[PDB]
A paper describes a structure:
The Cd arises as an outcropping of the Fd α9–β11 loop and superficially resembles a Rossmann fold consisting of an α–β–α sandwich but consisting of just four β strands rather than the canonical six. The Fd domain is a classic example of a Rossmann fold. The FAD cofactor was found to occupy a deep positively charged channel through the interior of the Fd in agreement with other published structures. This pocket has three solvent-accessible channels: only one of these channels (labelled ‘1’ in Fig. 4A; this channel will subsequently be referred to as the entrance) is situated adjacent to the isoalloxazine moiety and is wide enough to allow passage of the substrate. Channel 2 (subsequently referred to as the exit) is also adjacent to the isoalloxazine but partially occluded by it, meaning it is too narrow to allow passage of the substrate. Time course analyses using the DCPIP assay gave greater detail about the differences in substrate specificity. WT [name] showed highest activity against cyclohexanone, closely followed by 3-methyl-cyclohexanone, weak activity against 4,4-dimethyl cyclohexanone and no activity against δ-valerolactone and dihydrocoumarin.
Additionally, the final product is often contaminated with side products due to over oxidation and therefore requires considerable purification efforts. This manuscript focuses on a cyclohexanone dehydrogenase ([name]), EC number 1.3.99.14, an enzyme which can perform α,β-desaturation of carbonyl compounds with exquisite selectivity. CDHs belongs to the succinate dehydrogenase/fumarate reductase flavoprotein superfamily and use flavin adenine dinucleotide (FAD) as a cofactor to perform the dehydrogenation of cyclic ketones. The natural substrate for CDHs is cyclohexanone, a simple cyclic ketone. The SelenoMet WT [name] crystal structure was solved using single wavelength anomalous diffraction (SAD), using the selenium atom as the dispersion centre. The crystal structure of WT [name] is organised into two domains: a catalytic domain (Cd) which is situated at the ‘top’ of the enzyme when viewed in the orientation shown in Fig. 3A and an FAD binding domain (Fd) which is situated at the ‘bottom’.
Numbering used by the authors:
A (entry chain AAA), B (entry chain BBB): 63 to 598
The structure:
Amino acid sequence: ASFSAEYDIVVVGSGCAGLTSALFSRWHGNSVVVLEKAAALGGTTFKSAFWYWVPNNVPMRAAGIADPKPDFLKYVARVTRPQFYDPEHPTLGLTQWEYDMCEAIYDSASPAAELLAQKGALPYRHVPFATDYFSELPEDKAKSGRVLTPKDGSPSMANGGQVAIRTLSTAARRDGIAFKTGHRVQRVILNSKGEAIGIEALKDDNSVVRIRARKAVIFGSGGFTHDPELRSNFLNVPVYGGCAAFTNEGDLVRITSSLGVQLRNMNHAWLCPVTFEKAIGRDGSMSGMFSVAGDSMIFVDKRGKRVVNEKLNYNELCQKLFEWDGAKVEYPNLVLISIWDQRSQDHSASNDYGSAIVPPGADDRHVIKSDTLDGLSQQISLRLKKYAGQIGHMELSSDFNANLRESILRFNGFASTGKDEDFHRGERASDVLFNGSTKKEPDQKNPTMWPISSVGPYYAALVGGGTLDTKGGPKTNTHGQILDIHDKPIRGLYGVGNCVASASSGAYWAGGATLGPMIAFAYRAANAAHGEPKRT
Amino acid sequence: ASFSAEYDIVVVGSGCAGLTSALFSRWHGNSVVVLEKAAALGGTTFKSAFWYWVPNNVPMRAAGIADPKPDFLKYVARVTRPQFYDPEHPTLGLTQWEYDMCEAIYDSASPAAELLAQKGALPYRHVPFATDYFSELPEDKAKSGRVLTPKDGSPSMANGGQVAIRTLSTAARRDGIAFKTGHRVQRVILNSKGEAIGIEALKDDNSVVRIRARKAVIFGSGGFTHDPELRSNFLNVPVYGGCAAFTNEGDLVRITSSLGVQLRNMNHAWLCPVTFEKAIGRDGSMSGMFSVAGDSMIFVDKRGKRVVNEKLNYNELCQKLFEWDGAKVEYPNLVLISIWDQRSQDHSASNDYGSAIVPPGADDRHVIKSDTLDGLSQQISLRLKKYAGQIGHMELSSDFNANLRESILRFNGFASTGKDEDFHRGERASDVLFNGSTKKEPDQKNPTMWPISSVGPYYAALVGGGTLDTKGGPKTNTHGQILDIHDKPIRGLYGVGNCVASASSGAYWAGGATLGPMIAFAYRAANAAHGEPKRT
Ligand SMILES: Cc1cc2nc3c(=O)[nH]c(=O)nc-3n(C[C@H](O)[C@H](O)[C@H](O)COP(=O)(O)OP(=O)(O)OC[C@H]3O[C@@H](n4cnc5c(N)ncnc54)[C@H](O)[C@@H]3O)c2cc1C
Ligand SMILES: Cc1cc2nc3c(=O)[nH]c(=O)nc-3n(C[C@H](O)[C@H](O)[C@H](O)COP(=O)(O)OP(=O)(O)OC[C@H]3O[C@@H](n4cnc5c(N)ncnc54)[C@H](O)[C@@H]3O)c2cc1C
């Protein structure tokens, strides 16, 4: 029973979690390999803007923006476990584990960011204007300032992930880390003491390779969005997919099923609305709809009524789509219809951040069009019929047309006063902050709303619920060590990123709140793995 | 090193799943032991009404009533997977597994029920008037008739579970099945071929015993409602507890963590509202609130407004309590307040079916009382403050009193016309079916509503979200065999009832839809287990 290759540390996956874990490991003097399931490096990280939320970061301190630790913990506790949050409780109402993980994020994200930049692997610039998603909470004492992004990201920052994967992987090759693509890890090999001593991977040609790890196996294999069975059986909502890399199929869940782990936070994903047709069609370029485009634009349900603030934070807005009507045995908002006019088409269109409104040249198969409102509803009906088998054979109400006219009349009044009496669109900072581009109007009272045109053409797109990726898996301690059911480390076995349980439950603290913590844990995991004895 | 006892079949748990599995096994000629963690037999089953939903049962056929199998499958497919339900799809939109499991229920529930009755273990009577929970759906072609209950159950049927446990356990002892209480199974023992050959159990004195199973170990160990870590980490909603027996702590989840199983349907429980204070205080006698008592009674939120049909099916009503307000980072309906008057107190009180309205002599610590509405709100506020750390420090709104008066006036008008224009209380058959007792009023237009008295005293109780129990665990095939990750049986290992994955997802088809299927699977499991070779 022997191995065709041997390294000190074997890393699984080449997104943020894998690359950073590998670099930190290598810089301690270990030999390292990165095993990537796909043909290309980068996973979901590659598609991201690579905002990374780093509490008490060096640029903030240089700018004179304070980030006190007790207040950091209160902010995250209040957002993460609202029912239990208590400022007088010794762990703010969090479990000891959740509290310890949040503390580790605060302690380790900045040194991790600093080392990656110092070595030239992830040079950054500060994004001082990027504001926390629940900045209005009094617990938040550093409402803006925590976000970094790759130094050479574009001005929109939309290509940040591509830049990060380039800088990280360039530094990895420079520093002698080995890479194997088309290697799907499928097993952890144990010694007789039950310690991880290597992996088995399936190659594209269907050969199996065994690779030894002298000190540690570190998983950075991403989530399970694109295993439909796992997704449907674990998540708290029945999402249609998400912007995760399609190779993120929850392999670690199968890999650990015989290792005695504790699967934790399996009920939660990072959530976001998606352009429904791109989810169903498996458009690999799809982004979550982080900014819902248009000011002269509303969402309506199948009755032709507004049901939600369209500018609400994406992780929260997605949840509205899965409200349950128990009397009718249906999801009334399963798909919502975004409706906009020529003004929003011309001035709110974007290639970035999952906008449904796209400029000339962009893929617009998901866009529904008509010269009149009555014509639009007939076009929407055809689209619903096309996807009937995915959406409970949903149909527009027989009163749709008249309801939509009433909805627009009401909205147009709100747009003129600047006050949305129904859903408070534009009243929270995050509504304005992620509003997207608009035609700036001299006398606009609220930047998130402008009256919808009294003439066509009119445009629409179906909006459904998806993920960025999942955030449940084997529980680790704060050093990235995968625990057995008695809360003790399985020696040699580590996990970082979306493949292990996040301490953020169902919450999404700020932009960059996936990547920032992840880099902290890669640093802590690599530092602990470096201290393993060489084994078997 | 060895075993202190040996049987052909070892059954774990003494609720419906375990007792029926054991009886079926014994009647095939195997020696059988039943191992119970608690001091007494019966688990959650003991507390139930023991309705059991049996498609195509003998009473229905005697009435000349068809229960056509394709239509049975369409009903359960429509309720279980609403998004994907399609009458033209080869498995109605279900996965092959879901479809096969639902078919097995139809095929095996009636023969299982007939044999239990034939042997004198579970004599039954028909419950002809119990209509399915979604009987109005056109897919349901046998809208009433499927429910059986223990022949000697009381007229209310509330003691059906006690009767069933008595008849089942009496037959088990009569037929030579062995029983051991205070035996907490904690491990499955495997041979070198990886087959289950017995168990290890922890006894009360903290000794461990090994018991050999020549043919099979059959788990019927119930769900994980009362492991708060598992509950919070897996279920789709953050429930506070449930009427499951307190010994249902998800031991099988830990037992199988190194066995390579597929945990499935972990995101779903059988849901129901509960008397919140009884959940928090772990009242072991608590029932889920299947019947929300009172016609002169409303539920209000912390703003003093109605938000839901109070008579809606319990599994669906519970979901209303967990709607999420992303703008305020809170659950607006986390607890609702049931408010009633003297008429409902006197004529709707019940010790059964989880009623918050309780008769004289009953434990009434959960009941809030005051001589004016303004006084009632002051008493409710004190109760919210008592449980603040569990409910996000919820407070009544500053306009609560005025809103409550407006809510009562509006409801009173609905009660007089018989038409609840807001939430349609009483319009579905199931609202009437679980309406509970009421004072007969000559000219009452809708049995579920009567105007609330303009004089006190007034009464209230906090209502929160809970379970009957969970319905996620190791996936089995239709023969109750626990599968490995490659969908192949782990030889000798079986599971029946709440301890394994239900094929009903998040749905609750009808009264008796937990016990009816469970008896079908106990029969199929026992039949397959009987065919195992004797091993090790
Ligand atoms: C469009 C978009 C924008 C986003 N923007 C941001 C943002 O700006 N900030 C932020 O914090 N978050 C953002 N997110 C979320 C963020 O991208 C992810 O949470 C993060 O990139 C996940 O990193 P990871 O290393 O865990 O996984 P990934 O980057 O998904 O990498 C996992 C890798 O493991 C590989 N793998 C899987 N199985 C195996 C196996 N068996 N063997 C070997 N390799 C395997 C996969 O192929 C993949 O390459 C965004 C998400 C999307 C979709
Ligand atoms: C008040 C109430 C009323 C209900 N009414 C109905 C109804 O009318 N019809 C219906 O269909 N459903 C009803 N339900 C739901 C139904 O009672 C359950 O779904 C069903 O009884 C579960 O049966 P079971 O055998 O899987 O588990 P249980 O009856 O819970 O039995 C499991 C047993 O396993 C034991 N156990 C646990 N761990 C171990 C271990 N490690 N070793 C050994 N033993 C162990 C437990 O102590 C317990 O005795 C009701 C539920 C409640 C709470």
